[PDB]
Amino acid sequence: GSSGSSGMVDYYEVLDVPRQASSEAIKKAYRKLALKWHPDKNPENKEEAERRFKQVAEAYEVLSDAKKRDIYDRYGSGPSSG
Length: 82
Prior knowledge:
May operate as a co-chaperone of the male germ cell- and haploid stage-specific Hsp70 proteins. GO terms for molecular function: Hsp70 protein binding; unfolded protein binding. This is DnaJ homolog subfamily B member 3. By secondary structure, this protein is mainly alpha-helical. The chain has one domain (9-82): Orthogonal Bundle (Helix Hairpins), CATH 1.10.287.110. It is 50% helix and 0% strand. The longest helix has 18 residues, at 46-63.
């Protein structure tokens, strides 16, 4: 892909890893992004990094997890709840 896709936020695709990406492959592929789009590392692009890091962190925080990931891969995301 030239750039990717604009719209939804697919963790796996956000962390630059396949749907079957192994934990190690998810962390090794995320840790690089979390620090690549970090607001403390990207001063000039802090505005962008501050947003990219938000999706990247949530992605790994859900995939790297055994409970959040399973739920995500299984269902993913439901409608307004509460």
